[PDB]
């Protein structure tokens, strides 16, 4: 009978489990429900609130993984394995988690609400990498990771209807937030410090959260990893979400908005999943079919609107890259890329890749992104090819875009702070030549080398108790640098100056302009050409 | 002459016209015999005007060729009055029609044996210059380095390239013909003054750059030499030729503007007119504001050139050609102070975000406002995009590199693809004694002086670097001029100057430090403005 263990919500009594970190023990308690299974007639629909539940719910284990796309790309790889669900998967899987310092929390404990990424079509809060323990322990932080639907169950939207608005996997991850500031602080959380912090299409979805009025009351400070809510993937028009579902209602046999929804609510979950890849427009790498859609309700305008006009005055945000944003995303689908090769590619190869990597670049747009990242030392060496198709992809989906962002926010009113994440993890199965790939900061972030029988080095062990303290800080006060405190000081990102700092095992090192003149080149001047 | 026998019998001279006496110059290492003022046409003057040179019939007597001749007629810049910068290359003789005539620079006594011939084509856009200029003088390459060089006068401005394409009146390109006609008398006659037919190199700076690349792309004049010196300028590129079209229109307006109306008499009555007449409207005739622009230049009259230079380039076969092609290190900067909006020579030249686009206009203006936008963008420092340093120096290297670095970038690739052996320089040593302002690095046309020996002369007030710079880069070329290699055969101690190819790209920096090779002469912009600019029309 553990009483700091035993915890009351606004639903009802809660059972967690004892956790051990290497540091000590923490709480932890996995599998609340947030949200009313969205099952059946609530499927595409918006979250309803979980109901009250009597007895005491066991909340010792992880729940389902939301529908997804299983990759089956390299079976068995740990590379790709790692991000896997991990659970079972289920519809029924509006679950959240909570950790907390064993004992529970003295005094009202500054919150970090985690975000998976995954393309909007996959991701799960119970991997490994998002385990929570470690921040709890070492750091004695609050740490809240919700699921939230991926695919066509969290993003097929017929716009204007009522059965498929859209959006409801933000919706549900807001719904997670309400959650929070609801029954936080029976966990030892402050609800009045809550940061959201995310990678990829998490980074993306805090990105949305920022820019959604409704969401901006719950949350204070904002983290985005790898990723933004503009840029050319995070979101779609509501005429071509509306395409897509359409299409995809006819790839699966349906036939009216009613009428065919409706006939998508009678479809078992995997024939969805099966069709959901045949819907979209261009052969592309970092694209996807159902991801958010600019409603005018949760999305009152596009992103870039939104961010050209905001005011963000009361706003501190912590925004990055790593060092090889594109790499990972060759190996999915641009001819001359494998984890096995080397990947060295020709220049005709090249000419295709940039195709592919920039579907709606027109010919002209296209030939311009070909000659500026041509190396003309050397404009046929493989090598220099590979590594600048990987730049293009990269650039184009994350650099450019975290570096118009940062711009916008820090010019508007926004604490800004950046980084580029340089280390490349001495554990890491992907092959050397695709560097620092995406998402391979978050397990130093978590503090995953704190853990002896994980087969980190030591430096990476201090490295990761740096970044958990960065972070952490940032949680704390809005600002990354330590304020009792010898390593360089941390500088906020401005439109004048533009200074961020690179993140790896040497001390803070403060450069200036993030790929400015690449970014230059995507941001001001492409768009001139259409 | 009935005074042959009492004259110094090692400065007689006999040509296809007759006899000629020169002159003996001092040199700081010893005497030069030198041939001043030999003509080389009739004089295209009245009823010639805008016409072929006519080969100078010849004469009775001794040609008295001791003095400088007279100046091709031309505009003399007055900007400055008074300041060297600017009138080291003003005329130095009187202006005239009257200005077809060569020199030659010998050792003295003359060669023994047969001398490798170096040919000197002077620059000024086509509308100013001349053969006469102290920067031009010859006697330190025929001293030291024994060698034979000639140069020429070719009429510029209207009277060199006014043209009616079509006409047999105004054909266009006649001053290129006065200098075809030059280097076919060397061919006759050379060998009477120690040299050696066989092996003609040719060299020149900016427009006469152009013009040697010009005799590389015209069938009659190549075998009329066999190397041949580009030093910042290119036949291809955006100022060094008109077409026909263009080059009609342009005379019919200056002809409409002095007063002139079947292009028989309109060609008659602008040569009514008088020379300083020309030349005072030259000026009013070209569509935009334009630095580094000119009004007459050659024009593209299937016949000369029988296609555009690049054109000719890009089908070439140049296998049996050496070429040595080069730039200076701030090839704009010259040209800033002279029509951009906030440039001078006596300020520092600052200049506002505004005024750099204002710039980036006038500089190219050809290019459409997207063409201009993509120049501004690439030229911008985006940590410091309200630097007036930056911007200066910004403007700078957009005007050079539209003109000068890339078209020689260009050229050597092409050539270097298509057989020719190719050798490229950087030059960056800024001289001494330059009286232009700090913040123009090394300007357009101030490696000549070096190139021919100046420093030698202590009167001059040289650094004693500079003298040895100097003798380096006087052996550099005359190797190049007997060999067809840059490299002393025979040096093993200093470092090799290699070739230019398409795979490494290798070019060399001149300056007071041994010869350093680097990689890629401006590759990336070289490539915006070669490969990407072009497709934005």
Request: aromatic share 12%; net charge negative.
């Amino acid at each position: 009978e553990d009483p700091q263990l035993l915890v009351r919500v606004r639903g009802g009594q809660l059972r967690g489990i004892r956790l051990k970190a290497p540091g000590g023990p923490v709480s932890a308690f996995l599998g609340i429900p947030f949200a009313e299974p969205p099952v059946g007639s609530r499927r595409f629909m918006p979250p309803e609130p979980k109901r009250p539940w009597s007895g005491v719910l066991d909340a010792t284990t992880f729940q389902n993984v939301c529908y997804q796309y299983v990759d089956t790309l390299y079976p068995g790889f740990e590379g790709t394995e790692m991000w896997n669900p991990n659970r079972e998967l289920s519809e029924d899987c509006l679950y959240l988690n909570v950790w907390t310092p064993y004992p529970r929390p003295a005094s009202p404990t500054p919150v970090l609400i985690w975000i998976y990424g995954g393309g909007f079509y996959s991701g799960a809060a119970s991997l490994d990498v998002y385990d929570g323990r470690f921040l709890a322990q070492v750091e004695g932080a609050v740490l809240v990771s919700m699921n939230y639907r991926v695919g066509t169950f969290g993003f097929l939207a017929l716009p204007g209807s009522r059965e498929a608005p859209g959006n409801v996997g933000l919706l549900d991850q807001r719904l997670a937030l309400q959650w929070v500031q609801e029954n936080i602080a029976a966990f030892g959380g402050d609800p009045m410090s809550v940061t959201l912090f995310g990678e990829s299409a998490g980074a993306a979805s805090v990105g949305m959260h920022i820019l959604s009025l409704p969401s901006r009351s719950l949350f204070h400070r904002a983290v985005l990893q790898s990723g933004t809510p503009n840029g050319p993937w995070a979101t779609v028009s509501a005429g071509e979400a509306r395409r897509r579902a359409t299409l995809l209602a006819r790839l699966v046999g349906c036939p009216n908005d009613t009428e065919l929804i409706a006939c998508l609510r009678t479809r078992p979950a995997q024939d969805l999943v099966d069709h959901e890849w045949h819907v979209l427009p261009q052969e592309s790498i970092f694209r996807f079919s159902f991801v958010p859609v600019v409603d005018g309700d949760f999305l009152s305008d596009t992103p870039e609107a939104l961010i050209n006009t905001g005011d963000f005055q009361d706003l501190q945000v912590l925004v990055g890259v790593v060092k090889d944003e594109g790499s990972y995303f060759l190996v999915y689908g641009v001819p001359g890329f494998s984890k096995d090769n080397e990947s060295l590619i020709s220049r005709a190869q090249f000419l295709a890749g940039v195709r592919i990597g920039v579907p709606q670049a027109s010919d002209l747009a296209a030939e311009a992104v070909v000659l500026h990242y041509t190396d003309w030392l050397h404009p046929e060496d493989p090598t220099h090819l590979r590594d600048a198709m990987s730049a293009v992809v990269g650039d184009h989906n994350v650099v450019c875009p975290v570096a118009q962002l940062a711009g916008r926010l820090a010019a508007q009113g926004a604490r800004v702070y950046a980084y580029i994440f340089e280390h490349r993890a001495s554990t890491l199965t992907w092959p050397l030549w695709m560097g620092v790939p995406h998402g391979y900061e978050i397990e130093f972030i978590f503090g995953l080398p704190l853990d002896p029988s994980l087969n980190y080095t030591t430096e990476e062990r201090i490295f990761a108790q740096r970044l958990m303290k960065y972070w952490t800080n940032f949680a704390r006060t809005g600002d990354p640098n330590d304020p009792r405190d010898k390593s360089p000081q941390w500088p906020p990102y401005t439109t004048a100056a533009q200074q961020y700092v690179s993140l790896n095992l040497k001390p803070l090192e403060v450069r200036r302009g993030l790929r400015a003149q690449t970014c230059a080149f995507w941001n001001r001047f492409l768009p001139k050409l259409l």
